[PDB]
Design a protein around this ligand. Sequence first.
Ligand code: MYR
Ligand code: MYR
Lengths: 215, 214, 15, 15
Amino acid sequence: PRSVASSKLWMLEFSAFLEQQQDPDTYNKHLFVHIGQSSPSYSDPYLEAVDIRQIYDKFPEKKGGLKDLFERGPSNAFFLVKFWADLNTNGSSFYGVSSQYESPENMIITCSTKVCSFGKQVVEKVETEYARYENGHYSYRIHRSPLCEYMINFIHKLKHLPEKYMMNSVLENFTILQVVTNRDTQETLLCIAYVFEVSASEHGAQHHIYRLVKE
Amino acid sequence: RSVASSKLWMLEFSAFLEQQQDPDTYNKHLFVHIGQSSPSYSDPYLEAVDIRQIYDKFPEKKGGLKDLFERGPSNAFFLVKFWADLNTNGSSFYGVSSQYESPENMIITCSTKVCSFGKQVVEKVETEYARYENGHYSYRIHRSPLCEYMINFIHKLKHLPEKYMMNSVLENFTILQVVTNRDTQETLLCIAYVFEVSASEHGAQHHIYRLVKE
Amino acid sequence: PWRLRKXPDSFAKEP
Amino acid sequence: PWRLRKXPDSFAKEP
Ligand SMILES: *C(=O)CCCCCCCCCCCCC
Ligand SMILES: *C(=O)CCCCCCCCCCCCC
């Protein structure tokens, strides 16, 4: 569905994974989180709203922080994703992140991803993405970007915790902020706040998507 | 050296079977692959094969291998021998992936003809657009569904008792891939593929050859 | 705590 | 036959 979407840009996919090579011809891949489902773009369901003021203290609020960005707008570009992460894992290892975006227009875009601990930035990754023309529109893809060391270590530390409630306790103060901007106009195309809990489902990782509103 | 002309380089090619254990867990088996491990200092020099030795294994007459080679450029022509890993083991997806780079921004057409006794049995045609990437252009055919004929073919190979029998079937099976600049009709890459069954401990293998006039 | 914030009921119900 | 044609020795030697 065209859910995490402003008028200029739609995020179709987000996934973080662990890939293990048994032998040169055999690979096992485990997904921590994902967005993506089999429904067409126009399926776009009604999304519940979250008063953005309720989440400000989990992100940096300096010049160029979440409040600043939201007030500058467009406010219809702002979303909150809550993930229930699948941490049930078991050869050489690769930790990766993959994402996909679509637009009707050909832009050069910048994706900024900031990991936050107690509302303070601990690590940032910046990527510039160019379009491929595809099926009547423009596609932007990040394919198997290497997960940074801080996050690999964070996942290791969480897994060594004896109890699932303890993992959830650590996650109360862990957030990620993603800003996607048109490099030429400096327009905010998408802004996605992420928060995490440990999944207890047997049908894999789960999510809920919310619009962020001024209230 | 690599599968590269002056205008296009194929850095990645693979055919695979992917199986979903559960919604977050996937197993992938590679039948054949190029560029799975990174290009290195020690990669071997490419030996040469006289193309007149192989004409009968590929479509000929108008637009065939001979016709294409003579039009050239000759530096775009390669022969790959694969030793395929058929030792496989929920939902299943058979796919082919490939990746290319060029210094030029082009619209390319990739034609893949599966042949038996040198005659086409099925063809698959894909048009690919470029993506800008650090001063050059990249093209990707990503998890293209393997067509029924090849899925069926792989099943039937496995249902033969002996490997030498699999090799005998494969002696009359070829694949020809031609990549062209759609605008100019220039041949960017032409790759002939031939197969045997692997007996290696370290998985699927390949040798790559330049096709030459002598 | 997140549990005392004004948020929809779904935020605490894993689909 | 394939095995008798002029090709490098590597053609019938799996790496
Ligand atoms: C390092 O470069 C910072 C970029 C972070 C990439 C986002 C990864 C999303 C992590 C999801 C898995 C979290 C499981 C608790
Ligand atoms: C259908 O889409 C035919 C197109 C052929 C694509 C090339 C696939 C290469 C298969 C290699 C597997 C070898 C198994 C003996």
